Write an enzyme that holds these catalytic residues in place. Structure first.
Site, PDB file in Angstrom:
ATOM      1  N   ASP A   1     -65.232  90.478 108.725  1.00 29.64           N
ATOM      2  CA  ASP A   1     -66.398  89.823 108.157  1.00 29.64           C
ATOM      3  C   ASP A   1     -67.431  89.564 109.248  1.00 29.64           C
ATOM      4  O   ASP A   1     -68.501  89.017 108.994  1.00 29.64           O
ATOM      5  CB  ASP A   1     -66.005  88.533 107.416  1.00 29.64           C
ATOM      6  N   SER A   2     -67.099  89.982 110.468  1.00 25.62           N
ATOM      7  CA  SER A   2     -68.017  89.859 111.591  1.00 25.62           C
ATOM      8  C   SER A   2     -69.215  90.757 111.279  1.00 25.62           C
ATOM      9  O   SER A   2     -70.251  90.683 111.933  1.00 25.62           O
ATOM     10  CB  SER A   2     -67.334  90.311 112.885  1.00 25.62           C
TER      11      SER A   2
ATOM     12  N   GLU B   1     -57.598  83.930 118.229  1.00 24.57           N
ATOM     13  CA  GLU B   1     -58.938  84.001 118.793  1.00 24.57           C
ATOM     14  C   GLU B   1     -59.249  82.771 119.642  1.00 24.57           C
ATOM     15  O   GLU B   1     -59.099  81.636 119.188  1.00 24.57           O
ATOM     16  CB  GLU B   1     -59.970  84.138 117.666  1.00 24.57           C
TER      17      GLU B   1
ATOM     18  N   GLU C   1     -57.724  83.923 107.162  1.00 21.54           N
ATOM     19  CA  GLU C   1     -57.820  82.827 108.118  1.00 21.54           C
ATOM     20  C   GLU C   1     -57.199  81.555 107.569  1.00 21.54           C
ATOM     21  O   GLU C   1     -57.301  81.265 106.379  1.00 21.54           O
ATOM     22  CB  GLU C   1     -59.285  82.560 108.470  1.00 21.54           C
TER      23      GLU C   1
ATOM     24  N   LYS D   1     -56.569  90.731 106.324  1.00 23.36           N
ATOM     25  CA  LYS D   1     -56.551  89.630 107.277  1.00 23.36           C
ATOM     26  C   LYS D   1     -57.084  88.374 106.606  1.00 23.36           C
ATOM     27  O   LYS D   1     -58.069  88.424 105.876  1.00 23.36           O
ATOM     28  CB  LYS D   1     -57.412  90.001 108.493  1.00 23.36           C
TER      29      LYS D   1
ATOM     30  N   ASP E   1     -60.765  92.173 106.279  1.00 22.81           N
ATOM     31  CA  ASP E   1     -60.830  90.724 106.145  1.00 22.81           C
ATOM     32  C   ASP E   1     -61.123  90.271 104.728  1.00 22.81           C
ATOM     33  O   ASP E   1     -61.972  90.852 104.051  1.00 22.81           O
ATOM     34  CB  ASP E   1     -61.943  90.133 107.012  1.00 22.81           C
TER      35      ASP E   1
END
Lengths: 237, 248, 249, 249, 246
Positions: free
Chosen positions: C43-44, C168, C113, C111, C82
């Site tokens: 999502d970066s 991270e 979070e 992925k 993500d």
């Protein structure tokens, strides 16, 4: 320069009063940001101030997202967006979905109303990365305040509360408190822009001061607001 | 001047009878408001009086929101109460809240739901979230196709009262029973076919104006008959309700 | 083909895994050919592709779109996508639905979070055939919102069956302890060289952004004559354990 | 005007109830005028009207459509509508939503198929104002998928849940009789003997619309008459006189 | 006549091996039906054979309903079994029911799902509501991107839940034999030995449509015949004679 939750925490610890005002347009948001306003509240109060309705209940999530996007294009200040009536009280999952749309629209924090029964929702959101401003408002008030604090609310907002009581709450909870008609003992203050600018005719609420009168520019009227808030001048008796 | 829940509670305490009438159009709502009607019920009864159907079950949430918006443009001081229509609220308390929220957004000040003790949890869920509830018990039109009864009704009333119902509405209930309920629950009660000892009364506008052919129901009085205008018919209703001469 | 089994064998052998973000077909094919083993459709992209200030506005539609693009270019590398903000935190059922869309778009793993409160979701997905990369430490999706918590988060996802754990901006010593504690491979960014692998945003390591490089990022474009050579150099240093260097830790 | 009260009084008086399926306004009006007390808008239309091999493909939209059609023709008869396969078995909440659409379309009662496992749904609907006809025995919706005690349990489960009517299909007569004498609600049967409180047949079957010989428990009422009106009146008469079903059915 | 669940149970009881093949089109379905294939599997394997994808995960419920409708127009006596596609049924037993209901409406007579013990609750939920279930255990393609007692537990769990059929893929023949001897329902295998109650193969594999070396547990039945009809009849015959798998 960007105001974050940590910023508000440091200010509470230092005793520096936080200045909050509502905002629904880009131009005024930019003006207030540069004028020193730390928190911009895109509240459902727009249902009356902007939509011209008699209450805030008909404001939709789409309306809140639209105004949040508008305000986001104008403003350093932290943007807080109200979850509108009916869009979050069904369940904590519904609340998360609605709050997520507001965050995606530009909000940095969302505001919800309710007491202890809403604490579970505050926790659900905060744990998922969504900062929450819990709107409350004797022993019942304290319980509500603690419940949301325990749940991790980033900020507690009180409306129309006995000055002495608000002071006690502000000293009881770990998170910063914001008030309107709750005294100067709160960690900060909030007012509806249109009210403190004398946009509406006739007298103004007892707990609201007209900062337009005395100045010849909105930019100066807002700065005066911020000034008195930090000087603890406002609210007065 | 505006009628609020607090206004109704003060009236119950003072013994001042509350006058409620159904309304589905802006023009009639304004007329009834000006004539002294205190509560305007945007009821699913419109399924029969406005839509011409054989029952109220086919009425939708969109229909209820539409008529609520209409009545809201004509109402002034009267409190607007809107019915949650059949199928839009009984699935769960969450569904009920969603439907009720739409009605409040449409202009309602209170919503009405039908059902006994099994609906009390829904009443509580709504009221706690800012939506005033009128609990309709007794003979409920939505279930028209479907000693102990006395206690059952009393338990239904108490359940909703304890759950926080703002008002309890009884339909087709023995006068003596309705009186006991009214003296038991804390909230104001409104009745139709339930005697004059309730805290207020309600009638379908079209019924009391004699819009339908034939004879009126036993618990209904034609107020148009014997009066010189629709305005006078409504004023007569409000006056007899407060004088406790209606129902007779 | 790079499979979960491949990654586990590499962790056991101490062979470092090279991961890089990818959002387009052309670059994905280039990185695949250059030896990148894991391609992260992250999502970066909300910042590198969309130019936003945060990743919160990225939608599930956006993630599926870029996943489909990358899938048309990748061949041997494993594609990791993500789950975007708001599309999976409501419940494990919602997470499954979202992850299923990404798998349908070409992902080989997803992925997500979150700490301990997300372990139940990791388990729900893994049991249904969806490999999960559990992202802990600094989670960008909660940017507007410690040591023991990191360990607890890692253990929880590992016990729930996470295929990979990504850290991270974590103190090196800690990252090292986590890697030696969990059974699954670990990937790090700003977490030291003791992880089982490394990841960097492609644009960051190619020097696409003006100004000084992030502390834990190295410009691999500098000193090379092609994007291909830059990527190959990154893979080589990860395997040589020369990147991240003390300066990037 | 037939109501649930009417049916209960009939059960108590031993007056047999006549039910027939109906899918169109014209035939519904004819049957209503002929004395049929219950009109079943059944998913049997999947075969009789749509020409399919089973009732499973029938949708809720199809049921609402035919219910609306029959409602424009019926006068005094009670309209019962089948909840179609897939529209109500997910949960009692889904069943209520589906049943509510049928009631809005003109039904006065809904019919569902299933044993004890469906009793919770029966209770859920009945408590909310939706009369339920519980269909036990041979249930067409499960066609692709001691035993006497199970039937009795199914009947009692629905009766205790508040079912307005219990319908039995292809059940030993002696068994059907015991059930009828046990449950408090009226029973309707097809291929279940004459001791049920009423009978039902598919209109097209009893009018001999299909080629070949009718099922063993079905009688062709068209034969011997020269008007559909007379054929239906014969059915009503034989049901009330208890001459149908006969020993041969 | 028509092949029903009862027919399959009688076949298991008598030891008559069941012949199953995948089918995605009306023409081939009719051909296989006429050739004696008793079960037609409208499988998500169409994601690779028909759609040309690298896995079956991208197949949608709409795709499955479409091919099921196609096969139903061609089949006559054979039983149609349709796969619940990836993502369409694992969210909850309620979601699985909705998806299965759509497949039944499209023409299926049974639905297939993939998963071990964790899916048995779903098997029970569907079976109780009239939807026959084929429980696919062993090597499940839907989990491609992600032992003896585990398989036995999976088979037992589904059988106890009322599965109509249990399908095993790529399992040691000795293990498959034990399962078949212990569960009440018929078993079908692919890469699971000949001791199962029946066999299944992807039509395209057994007709030698794909280039490359023949898969280990697959036999090319096209070779030696000059009509697809004869090729299929040969498959059915070998399954019946227990000569396939060898």
């Amino acid at each position: 320069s960007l105001i974050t939750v940590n910023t508000l925490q440091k200010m509470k610890a230092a005793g520096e009063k936080i200045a909050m005002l509502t905002a629904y347009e880009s131009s005024f948001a930019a003006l207030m940001d540069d004028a020193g306003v730390e928190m911009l509240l895109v509240g459902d109060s727009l249902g009356m101030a902007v939509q011209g309705r008699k209450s805030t209940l008909p404001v939709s999530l789409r309306d809140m997202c639209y105004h949040t996007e508008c305000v986001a294009r104008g403003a350093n200040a932290m943007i807080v967006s109200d979850l509108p009536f009916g869009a979050y009280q069904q369940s904590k999952e519904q609340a998360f979905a609605a709050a997520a749309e507001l965050m995606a629209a530009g909000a940095h924090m969302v505001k919800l109303e309710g007491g202890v029964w809403m604490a579970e929702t505050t926790e659900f959101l905060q744990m998922r990365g969504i900062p929450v401003c819990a709107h409350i408002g004797a022993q019942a008030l304290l319980n509500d305040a603690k419940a949301h604090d325990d749940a991790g609310a980033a900020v507690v907002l009180m409306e129309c509360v006995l000055a002495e009581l608000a002071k006690k709450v502000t000293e009881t909870v770990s998170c910063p408190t914001i008030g309107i008609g709750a005294g100067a003992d709160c960690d900060g203050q909030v007012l509806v822009m249109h009210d403190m600018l004398g946009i509406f005719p006739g007298k103004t609420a007892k707990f609201v001061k007209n900062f337009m009168q005395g100045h010849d520019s909105v930019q100066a009227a807002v700065r005066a607001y911020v000034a008195e808030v930090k000087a603890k001048t406002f609210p007065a008796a």
